[PDB]
Design a binder for this molecule. Structure first.
Ligand SMILES: CCCCCCCCCCCC(=O)O
Ligand SMILES: CCCCCCCCCCCC(=O)O
Lengths: 546, 164
């Protein structure tokens, strides 16, 4: 997901502005739904929410707009258990053997005969939480096992937290309300207000360990691989208690990253670090935020946001609707050089022509070059030291860049990867005249609607994930609820769409109406004031009671 | 009772719910959401109740693409009655009222539904919901950044046998 908040120092009108571009499933329990909620005099908020929740999750009100992105902070820890050498159902804490608890659950299963039978299953639990097995990595043998402590199991504040956000007046109020309750489970929050403040908060529920405990409490080999794993045989590796935290064992709000500025803040699912490069966020716990290389979506955003030129609503909208495949910027120039260097190779001819003609986009009319580029990048990602300029922490926005074609071993492997990618594309059932929109679709009844965008891993800001189904790529997730909010004098102006439409039901008048609009990238007013609502010639009203 | 909402829909079926209190507000939300998505919510509640195998057998999957039986074991473990009760007890009066209203409004739509916008009319799993069902959904979402990612791993965790 992407989020951009612009403040008074950079906005065209000197006020706040927010782009919300969550990338979430197109079906199921996380399918966004638009609604506007009003209790006259004390609540007036509009946005979109996940199924079953009577609050607005991403939205705006009279003076405020906010959104969320999945963060890089840990929201659980694994605990490696040292098993009792005499009994693999017992584990050691400070050298003392403790029994595992056994909780049985019973499930009814409908069989082939249509009758129900009862299945009983035993869940083993430690003082930390339930045991988990990843065969071949996190096993349960006679020496060790792994338990999982989820910090959000004790977060009973989640709904109150969003309802409180729904009642927030401005950025300062929003910050107070989130830091006070600490009910946000696993997302960043970004916001802008009418006065022109731009806010980023990495304010969620995160296991807390005091700094001095981390060196000895971490499992070195697992933390190196990005798993929050701790030593479960030492009581001193329990999550630390701090009276200032809203929940025992979680990180106090003062210790989590916050950036409050008047130019911009952004996030595309990387850590807090480069939210705004002019002011890096550093020195946090490894469970909270680390200085890891940013992904190409953030790199794309920063290439467009940095500088002195004012940002207008149109600028932020077009960062989505351009469908620019930003990963091409690092790779395609040198790849085309390699192509020109190998004009004798008939195995490369079709691929190289397609890449040369490609508009570097994931637009509906983008050529098969995007497909060739995707299959090449999947292989390029697996090559060792093929970057001309590797990632440089002192140039975190401009590296990695280019192919190290001057190394003979790289040139060979890169050509082979292109040869292999071309063979794969040609083995598939795609005519070379077909364009991206001919391939990527969302099915609605018996028909298909062409969908622009591409995988976020290729640096397409309008991230769309698809899977092969039948003869097409079926969209499964990505750009979902779009909201672009500014604050002109009359009241908040919100523009956007719900890409997959309000209703998941094929019978509904609102099953595919916004999907047709998403396909054509035609965003619409999100009416909020009574004047806007009353101006809508489709306005319908129903009052209900019981 | 004490449930009342005014709902306006603009283009594309976006609801604008007005009410004097949280119960009424939830009433409007549950009703409007059901009009568009009753079947979706019914299915996800089945999932969160750990009842997929009961309605659909062992061969199917949830919308998170977990096998029905492991999914059920996970949600039966997650959404035990004691866990739901403690979660409810910790809720403010405003949130309880939002949830009570929502369940009532969703159920109102179900009573009235004739299939106009509901493709799963007549399915045994399309049924009146309770506030506990909304707690089940909430807790399912709550753990997506945690133990929910390890649902299969939790189900797979069994002590060693006599092996070498
Ligand atoms: C009960 C848990 C509620 C969680 C609500 C999450 C809302 C934001 C989800 C979108 C985040 C993203 O797109 O990265
Ligand atoms: C089906 C693909 C759509 C993208 C959905 C990704 C969001 C998952 C939210 C899980 C929260 C987390 O990852 O910690």
């Amino acid at each position: 997901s992407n989020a951009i908040a612009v403040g008074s120092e950079r906005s065209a009108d000197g006020k706040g502005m927010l782009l919300a571009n969550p990338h979430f499933p197109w079906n199921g329990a996380m399918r966004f739904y638009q609604m506007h909620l009003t209790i006259p005099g004390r609540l007036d908020v509009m946005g979109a929410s996940l199924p079953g929740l009577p609050v607005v999750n991403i939205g705006f009100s009279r003076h405020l707009a906010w959104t969320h992105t999945v963060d890089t902070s840990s929201h659980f820890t694994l605990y490696r258990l040292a098993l009792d050498p005499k009994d693999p159902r017992r584990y050691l804490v400070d050298g003392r053997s403790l029994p595992l608890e056994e909780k049985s659950v019973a499930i009814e299963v409908r069989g082939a005969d249509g009758k129900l039978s009862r299945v009983e299953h035993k869940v083993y639990q430690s003082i930390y939480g339930p045991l988990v097995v990843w065969p071949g990595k996190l096993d349960w043998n006679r020496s060790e096992a792994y338990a999982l402590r989820d910090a959000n199991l004790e977060n009973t504040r989640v709904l109150q937290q969003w309802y409180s956000i729904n009642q927030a007046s401005d950025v300062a109020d929003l910050r107070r309300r989130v830091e006070a309750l600490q009910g946000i489970p696993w997302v960043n929050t970004l916001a802008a207000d009418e006065q022109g403040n731009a806010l980023y908060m990495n304010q969620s529920v995160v296991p807390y360990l005091k700094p001095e405990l981390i060196p000895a409490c971490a499992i070195p080999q697992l933390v190196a691989e990005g798993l929050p794993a701790l030593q479960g045989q030492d009581s001193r590796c329990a999550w630390s208690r701090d009276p200032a935290a809203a929940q025992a064992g979680i990180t106090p709000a003062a210790q989590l990253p916050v950036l409050l500025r008047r130019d911009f803040v952004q996030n595309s699912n990387d850590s807090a670090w480069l939210t705004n490069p002019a002011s890096p966020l550093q020195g946090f716990s490894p469970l909270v935020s680390q200085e890891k290389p940013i992904g190409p979506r953030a790199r794309y955003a920063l290439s467009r946001l940095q500088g002195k030129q004012p940002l207008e609503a149109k600028t932020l909208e077009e960062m989505v609707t351009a469908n620019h495949v930003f990963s091409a910027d690092q790779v395609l120039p040198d790849l085309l050089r390699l192509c020109r260097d190998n004009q004798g190779e008939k195995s490369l001819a079709r691929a190289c022509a397609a890449l040369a003609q490609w508009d570097r986009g994931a637009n509906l009319d983008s050529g098969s070059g995007f497909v060739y580029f995707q299959r090449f990048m999947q292989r390029f990602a697996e090559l060792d030291g093929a970057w001309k300029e590797p990632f440089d922490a002192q140039r975190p926005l401009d590296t990695p860049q280019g192919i190290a074609l001057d190394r003979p071993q790289v040139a060979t492997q890169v050509r082979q990867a292109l040869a292999d990618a071309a063979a794969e594309v040609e083995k598939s059932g795609i005519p070379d005249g077909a364009r991206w929109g001919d391939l990527q679709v969302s099915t609605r009844g018996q028909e298909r609607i062409a969908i622009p965008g591409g995988d976020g891993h290729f640096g397409v800001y309008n991230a769309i994930q698809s899977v092969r189904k039948g003869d097409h790529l079926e969209v499964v997730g990505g750009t979902s609820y779009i909201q672009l909010v500014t604050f002109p004098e009359e009241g908040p102006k919100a523009r956007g769409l719900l890409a997959f439409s309000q209703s998941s039901d094929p019978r509904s008048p609102h099953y595919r109406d916004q999907t047709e609009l998403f396909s054509r990238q035609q965003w619409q007013t999100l009416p909020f004031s009574d004047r806007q609502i009353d101006a809508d010639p489709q306005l319908q009203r129903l009052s209900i009671r019981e | 009772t004490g449930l009342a909402a005014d709902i306006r829909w603009t283009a594309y079926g976006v609801p604008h719910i007005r009410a004097k209190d949280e119960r009424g507000l939830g009433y409007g939300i549950g009703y409007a959401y059901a009009r568009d998505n009753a079947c979706l919510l019914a299915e996800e509640i089945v999932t969160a109740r750990g009842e997929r195998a009961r309605y659909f057998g062992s061969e199917g999957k949830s919308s998170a693409e977990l096998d029905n039986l492991p999914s059920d074991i996970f949600y039966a473990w997650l959404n035990q009655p004691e866990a739901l009760q403690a979660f409810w007890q910790a809720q403010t009066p405003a949130v309880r009222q939002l949830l009570e209203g929502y369940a009532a409004g969703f159920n109102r739509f179900l009573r009235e539904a004739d299939g106009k916008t509901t493709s799963c009319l007549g399915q045994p799993w399309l049924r009146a919901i309770a506030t506990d069902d909304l707690l089940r959904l909430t807790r399912r979402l709550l753990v997506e950044g945690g133990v929910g990612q390890f649902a299969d791993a939790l189900v797979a965790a069994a002590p060693p046998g006599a092996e070498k």
